[PDB]
Amino acid sequence: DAKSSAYSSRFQTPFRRRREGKTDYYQRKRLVTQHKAKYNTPKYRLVVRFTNKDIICQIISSTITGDVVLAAAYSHELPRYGITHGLTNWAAAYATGLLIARRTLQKLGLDETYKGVEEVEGEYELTEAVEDGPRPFKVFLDIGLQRTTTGARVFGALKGASDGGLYVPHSENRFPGWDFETEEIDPELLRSYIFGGHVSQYMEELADDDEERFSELFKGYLADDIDADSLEDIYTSAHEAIRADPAFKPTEKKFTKEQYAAESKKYRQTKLSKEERAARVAAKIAALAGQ
C-alpha cells in the first residue's frame, strides 16, 4: 500500500493457512470428513507436494488436535537407492510414490500380502483385493493447490503409490500417454516417463544440436559419467532397491536439539519488556523538547 479504523475493526481475517495461501479448505472438508456411521475410522490422504528441489510424500490422517503423519518419504532420500539427479522430475515422483507405499505397507505389516506391480509396463490397474484376507490399505490423493493436468508429476507419485500396492482410487486420463481424441492410454509413453525416457530422449536430442546448453544443463550427468541410455537402468535398479529395504533411516545429526537451538538463539531478536519501551518514549520526548 490508508485503512480507516472502521475498515480495520470490521475486517474478518481468513484462516491462518488461507492467509498463508497454503490450504484449500473447501477441498480439505471434502477430503477429511468421514461417514458419521464409520465413527473413528480415519481417512488417510496421500499428500504429495513439490517444492523446487524436493518431493514430499506423506500419509496423513486428521484429529481435532492436528493432522498426524503415518509415514513420509522425501525425494532427497533417493540417493540411498541410487538416484542422485533430477530429484524433482516425473521419474523421481514415481520412485517417491513407490517408496511411501512400500514403507507404509511394511509398517502396517501388509507388504507380503500386497506386492504391487513388480513388472511395470505402464498399465492402468488398481490394487485388487485378495480373496479371503485383508483388504488393501486405501488412501486418497490430496494434491493441495496443484493444478490437475495430463502428465503432471503429481499423478506420477500416484502411479508409484498404486504400483507399490496402496489402493489409491484413480482414473487413467491424467497420465502422460492419455490420447484425448480416442480416449485411451498408450502404455509405451507412460512406461517411458516412469524411467525418465523424456529426460533421456532430451539429452540425446540436445547433445547434438546445442552442445553449449547440454554442458550447462546436464553438467552433473557429464561429471558423474552418466550417458542418456543408462537412465532406464538407474530407475530400474532404484525400484528394486526401494522394494528390498523401504524402511526409513534418519540422518545421523551432527549436533543435538539443544546445540542447534543455542546457535539459532544467537540470531533471534528479543522483545523490549515494558520498561525499555517506556524509557525509549521518555528519551524521544527529550530529543524534541530541546529542538
Binding site: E20, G21, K22, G144, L145, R147
Partner: protein, 168 residues
C-alpha cells in the same frame, strides 16, 4: 545495486479501439496479427452508450499482449514514430508508461487498401524480478515497498536505456 532489482518489460500491450463491430474490427485484427505474430483478442462493450454508437456486448476493440524479445522489438518500432520523446505525463504512478501512434504504417508495414489505416495504444508494463510472488497460485504475496516500481524509477531507466528525452 542488487541485480535482482533491475527493471524489465513485464509485457507490452497493443490496443486498437475501433468504434464499430463489423468489417473495420476484423481489419484491425489483421493488423495486430501480422505485427505481433500472434492471434489477437477482441473485447466487448461493457454497456450501451448511444453517442459513441455501441451496444452492450457489441464486440468493438482488439488487443494483444507481447512479452520478452518481440516486446523489445515492437517497442523500438513504436518509439521511432515518437522520435524517442515521451511526456512526463505518460508515466503512471505505478511506474508503467504508454504512448500512442496515429497510422500503423509508420511502424513499418506495407499499406494494403483492403485493410486501411489504424491508430494504436502502446502500453508498457514494468516490473522487477520476483513479481511471480503476486501472480502464482500458492503463497500469493505482495511485493515489498522497496521493490515496487515507481514513476521516478521508470523514467530514469527509460532515459538511460534507449537514450530518450522526457518533456515537461
Amino acid at each position: 545495486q542488487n541485480p535482482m532489482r533491475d527493471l524489465k518489460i513485464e509485457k507490452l500491450v497493443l490496443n486498437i479501439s475501433v468504434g464499430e463491430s463489423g468489417d473495420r474490427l476484423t481489419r484491425a485484427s489483421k493488423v495486430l496479427e501480422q505485427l505481433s505474430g500472434q492471434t489477437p483478442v477482441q473485447s466487448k462493450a461493457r454497456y450501451t452508450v448511444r453517442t459513441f454508437g455501441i451496444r452492450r456486448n457489441e464486440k468493438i476493440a482488439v488487443h494483444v499482449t507481447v512479452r520478452g524479445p518481440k516486446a523489445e522489438e515492437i517497442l523500438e518500432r513504436g518509439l521511432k514514430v515518437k522520435e524517442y520523446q515521451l511526456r512526463d505525463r505518460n508515466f503512471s504512478a505505478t511506474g508503467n508508461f504508454g504512448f500512442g501512434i496515429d497510422e500503423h504504417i509508420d511502424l513499418g508495414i506495407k499499406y494494403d487498401p483492403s485493410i486501411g489505416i489504424f491508430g494504436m495504444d502502446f502500453y508498457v508494463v514494468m516490473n522487477r524480478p520476483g513479481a511471480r510472488v503476486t501472480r502464482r497460485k500458492r503463497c500469493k504475496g505482495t511485493v515489498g515497498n522497496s521493490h515496487k516500481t515507481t514513476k521516478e524509477d521508470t523514467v530514469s531507466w527509460f532515459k538511460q536505456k534507449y537514450d530518450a528525452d522526457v518533456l515537461d
